[model samples]
Target: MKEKIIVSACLLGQPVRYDGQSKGIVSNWLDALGAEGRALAFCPEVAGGLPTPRPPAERQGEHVVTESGLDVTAEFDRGAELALGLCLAQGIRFALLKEGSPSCGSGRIYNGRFEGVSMAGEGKTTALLRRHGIQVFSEDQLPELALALSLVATA
Candidate 1:
């Protein structure tokens, strides 16, 4: 069965990040996916009703808090749940998520500090996706995903 690939909208240059900026990856294959309409654009923070240019958040323990010390855990949880529902509905098998984001980081997220320091950890959405059996990869791992896809196609 063919499954859709879930991708971070910001990585696709959608300007959906918390600061209204995009961390678009430079990948011809990713561009092709967009051009061919094969990638599903997703932004959990936005989908959870958070506005772009909103407060920066970090995962602290089991909760998410904004840089200003505002608790936004429920919003993140709602976003993750919604994303999961969409993935399940679309039979998504993989994801290309942003790195170091409180909601989307697959590994090495911010260490609950407003500082630029990072630690080994997965974001809420990434953890949830993995728990649901979805393969999650950071945008930097696009090459790995491409290689895997090529191998699968040849198999």
Candidate 2:
């Protein structure tokens, strides 16, 4: 009953962010998982057809809009559905997503003002994955994720 984990592509060194920058964590254990084929890297926004260095978007009430006011809610939803489909297809229940990303944030997201602000909210994909019973974790919550994984492994 070994479990597989879905991780943010950007966290794995993919330059998929809106700013075209990548910031991967330094975790030997995570790399081991990747080497063991227990980790899958993904980017919902990129998978939904958004380009790197694209306009930054944020969760605004119920819609995802870009800095210039272009609504990208449809793309976000599309990617979320795709993520759910991948999880179901792979029997995955755990996701290690990027923090404060419009498409992957788990506990906090940027408020829709284009300014430096933070608010309590899950991202589009995180919400859908949780709704379908997936456990989502942010980059800052690796220890919690390890505990959950250990529990799952023990069971």
Leading candidate by TM-score:
2
- Highest lDDT: give the candidate number: 2
lDDT value, residue 131 of candidate 2: 99
Across residues 1-155, which tens digit of lDDT does each residue of candidate 2 receive? 66898998999989988889997899887888899899899899988888888988988878999878899998999999999999999999999999998889988998888898999988999999999999999989988887787787845
lDDT minimum window of 10 residues, candidate 1:
146-155
Cα deviation in Å at residue 69, candidate 1?
1.8
Query: Model 2 compared with the native: what TM-score?
Result: 0.96
The true-structure Cα RMSD of candidate 2 reads 1.1
Candidate 1, number of clashes: 0
Give the poorly placed runs of model 1, Cα more than 4 Å off.
none
Show the lowest summed lDDT stretch of 10 residues, model 2.
146-155
lDDT of each prediction vs. the true structure? 0.86, 0.90
Backbone clashes, each candidate: 0, 0
**Candidate 1: tens digits of C-alpha lDDT, residues 1-155:** 33468898899889988888888888889888778676899999999889888988899999999878899998899999888998999877788899888889987899987788999999989999999998899987888876665555533
Candidate 2 achieves a global lDDT of 0.90
